[PDB]
Design a protein around this ligand. Structure first.
Ligand SMILES: *[C@H](O)[C@H](C[C@@H]1CCNC1=O)NC(=O)[C@H](CC(C)C)NC(=O)OCc1ccccc1
Ligand SMILES: *[C@H](O)[C@H](C[C@@H]1CCNC1=O)NC(=O)[C@H](CC(C)C)NC(=O)OCc1ccccc1
Lengths: 303, 303
């Protein structure tokens, strides 16, 4: 009868983190079999980061101009290359502690754990979701670039995010493990800003079903809505519209619970139009949106 | 300029988790050098758990009546013993992946990470605090007993909690790694209940300093209080009284920030007596109390 934000266990990823040092710039990278992935801005200097041409910067570099540590050991770079916003560094060693793994591009709304690292060494782990404006509400200090995000699905690590930068509003932006940014950002110390964020409706609904599965039913109601009429209020409270695809996803949850999706929608419309009367759902006073339908099922069981 | 609940990286502890199976009862245990720690109620049957005499139950058991798995491998028990609410099981193998470690008894208010496990295998990690009524607000399903809690301080794991049970209100109770319970609980399926909880004042204050260190100052004020006058309102809002020891602990935070402790107190008294005007501190709408002064310093830096 309890329920909260849970991060994936982080051992499989700890063994892949390493230092990458290039002049006076030090950040983290990811050592999979004989390759090390890291943000390309590791080769800029202080000046460089306002307007770099990474083509230009990288032809100036040698395999020896990159220093890589794994605790004590130094690692020999024997090749380097650029894949969009990451460098791939070849090394003379296969990481013996490389897990079964995949590179995935996540869609917005989806959640993942991030292992926050500094100077190659893990510092903490926490759970995060990709916002609809393609940022994440992270916790990242100077030196965190290269920290990764990931899910685990039956011993197989799915890497989905590498950290590159913090936007003026305090939110964070980055790329998948193929170097393509999430969002319209570029890896440049310039005037960029996060676009308007919205609430992830699918996850809010997922969490209300969790509230019911943990015994709690005070917000439900008799009324009901259509999809169209629910979206009219979604818009004016800045919630993503609900789609038949999203309704379908809430299938197992609505089945386990007895509550049709559009009734949970009517409940949410009621909660939006009237706040919540000094009440809480699963210990929270606010509608929380960083749990997916799949997180909810992972955690709990019973009604 | 961002800030949240962060758990310790969990790799050093993942390598110590194992299954312990005894008839039809299966739970987790902790494999340090040649010893495995686990809750003693692993030897009860369904009936037994209402009123066990664990003396009685254990003289009936043999080293062979305990089954221990570490993934595939089965482990040979060659000794067993009872230390208050834990069993110590001797095995023919030293865990090769045992870290530098300590057993610590935490005090209330202090925080730790828990690695939630089922059938010997890690499932998730999250951050938790020992409430003043000696429970924790956890997330634990059937089969979670034996899951541990821990901090890390320069590569050395400090184990402080083993999970034993869930109280009727949905909160959780357990022991240190010497088998002494936190709180007046016993490991018995009987009528027990959590006593009245209170808010951890020290941590709330710690977090307001974090709010200032992340730029944010809207709740501060000109007024000030004495310690005595602040406690009169602490009582009637169910906050722990503040003590000169607690004032002293907030020393580095008040120094880094410019704000004397009793002024932050006056700010908090103001926030208590007038709610918060649809405002948030570090993204939260509520006074949050599961960060210690030491967590706060760990995370951030800058004003
Ligand atoms: C890489 O370690 C770093 C992580 C930033 C630094 C502060 N908080 C973070 O998340 N990335 C950058 O510093 C980035 C440089 C690349 C785009 C070339 N610049 C940036 O993120 O500007 C924001 C900033 C905020 C606070 C201090 C310094 C920079
Ligand atoms: C050990 O795996 C288990 C963990 C409980 C089970 C459900 N949620 C938990 O945290 N411990 C017990 O089941 C405990 C037995 C020992 C005291 C002998 N009994 C208990 O905690 O009763 C509460 C309960 C709640 C929901 C389902 C079953 C039991």
């Amino acid at each position: 009868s309890g329920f909260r934000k849970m991060a994936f266990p982080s051992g499989k990823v700890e063994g892949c983190m390493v230092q990458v040092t290039c002049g006076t710039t030090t950040l983290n990278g990811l050592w999979l079999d004989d390759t090390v992935y890291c943000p390309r801005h590791v080769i800029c200097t202080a000046e460089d980061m306002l307007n770099p041409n990474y083509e230009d910067l990288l032809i100036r570099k040698s395999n020896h101009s990159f220093l890589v540590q794994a605790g004590n050991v130094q690692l020999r770079v024997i090749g380097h290359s650029m894949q969009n916003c990451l460098l791939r560094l070849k090394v003379d060693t296969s990481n013996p502690k490389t897990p079964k793994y995949k590179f995935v591009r996540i869609q917005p709304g989806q959640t993942f754990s991030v292992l926050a690292c500094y100077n190659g060494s893990p510092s903490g782990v926490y759970q995060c979701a990709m916002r609809p404006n393609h940022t994440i509400k992270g916790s990242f200090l100077n030196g965190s670039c290269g920290s990764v995000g990931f899910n685990i699905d039956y011993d197989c690590v799915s890497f989905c995010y590498m950290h590159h930068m913090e936007l003026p509003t305090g939110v964070h932006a980055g790329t998948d493990l193929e170097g393509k940014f999430y969002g319209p950002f570029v890896d440049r110390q310039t005037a960029q800003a996060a676009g308007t964020d919205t609430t992830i409706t699918l996850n809010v609904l997922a969490w209300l079903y969790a509230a019911v599965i943990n015994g709690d039913r005070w917000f439900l109601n008799r009324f009901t809505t259509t999809l169209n009429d629910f979206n009219l209020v979604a818009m004016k409270y800045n919630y993503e519209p609900l789609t038949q695809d999203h309704v379908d996803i809430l299938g197992p949850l609505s089945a386990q619970t007895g509550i049709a999706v559009l009734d949970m929608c009517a409940a949410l419309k009621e909660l939006l139009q009237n706040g919540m009367n000094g009440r809480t759902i699963l210990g929270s006073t606010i509608l929380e949106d960083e749990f997916t339908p799949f997180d909810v099922v992972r955690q709990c069981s019973g009604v």
